[PDB]
Design a protein around this ligand. Structure first.
Ligand SMILES: O=C(O)c1cccnc1
Length: 291
């Protein structure tokens, strides 16, 4: 029906067919992501005898994805029990913060490795290519500071919203208002998408015009740059387009009738799982590749 949130008249339902498809999806995600991220972190922690900036950034990406998919199982249980998150108040804040901060970190580090590749390919002699490991550590800590600085507001709020008989633990909710959460999601998709697309296009154009693509290994690198672009789009475009659609019908129509939302809600959360695929799809493209 129509619920109520302070200063925000919201309406989010508990429709079925969300506990039969989403829990198995999240189970597969957690299994594969935990396995891949553990087998990736094993090399970095123990049997990697070198480092440098690019491996620093890949290690940070793996750390972010690892924390994300260890955060997954509680969210999986929350989906299983049909929005009945019966853990408390601190667990809600922690899980929402973990999910959002780790997604921001994954996206920011994807963008930064794309920019690193763009500098390494189009401007090989730029001073940013020759960057010290301490400088890389400072830059990565600064990036983590930027990531956290936009997300601590999920710790101040009372996340476990009690309504009717249920305890909602969802940061993504639809309300007749604009908050920094939705806007941050919008830029989270758009601006890194623009940077990644520009970097990939410039890399491809410079490599092809240099006519060095004839090498049997450059072709694999090009196809994996393309692959990383397409997987980024595949995991991030659906949820964002559903958010744009719900913004459109919220602006045009409003919240007078709450029954024009059901569909645009349900698939939304399903699309919301697509980005978690990135966590379980990053190891195959980023680390396990490039022999
Ligand atoms: O941040 C997320 O991905 C999220 C937020 C609320 C509910 N489910 C997932």
């Amino acid at each position: 029906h129509f619920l109520e949130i302070d200063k925000k008249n919201c309406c989010v339902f508990r429709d079925d067919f969300i506990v039969k498809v989403l829990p198995p999806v999240l189970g597969l995600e957690f299994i594969f992501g935990l396995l891949g991220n553990g087998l990736a972190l094993w090399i970095f922690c123990f049997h990697l005898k070198s480092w440098k900036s690019s491996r620093i950034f890949l290690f940070n990406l793996a750390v972010a994805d690892f924390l994300l998919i260890i955060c997954l199982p509680f969210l999986m249980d929350n989906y299983v029990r049909r929005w009945d998150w019966k853990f408390g108040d601190i667990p809600c804040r922690l899980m929402l913060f973990m999910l959002a901060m780790n997604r921001q970190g994954s996206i920011i580090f994807l963008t930064v490795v794309a920019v690193d590749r763009y500098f390494r390919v189009v401007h090989p002699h730029h001073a940013l290519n020759k960057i010290s490991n301490r400088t890389a550590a400072i830059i990565s800590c600064l990036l983590w500071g930027i990531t956290i600085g936009l997300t601590v507001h999920l710790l101040k709020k009372k996340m476990p919203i009690q309504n009717g008989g249920a305890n909602l633990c969802s940061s993504f909710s639809i309300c007749h208002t604009f908050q920094w959460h939705e806007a941050m999601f919008l830029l989270e998709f758009f601006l890194p998408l623009g940077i990644i697309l520009f970097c990939s296009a410039r890399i491809i154009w410079s490599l092809r015009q240099r006519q060095m693509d004839r090498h049997a290994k450059i072709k694999r690198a090009i196809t994996f740059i393309m692959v990383v672009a397409i997987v980024f789009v595949i995991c991030f475009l659906p949820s964002v387009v559903v958010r744009i659609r719900i913004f459109w019908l919220l602006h045009t129509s409003g919240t007078q009738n709450c029954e024009v939302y059901r569909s645009v809600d349900l698939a939304f959360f399903i699309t919301l799982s697509f980005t978690y695929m990135n966590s379980m799809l990053d190891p195959v493209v980023y680390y396990f590749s490039s022999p």
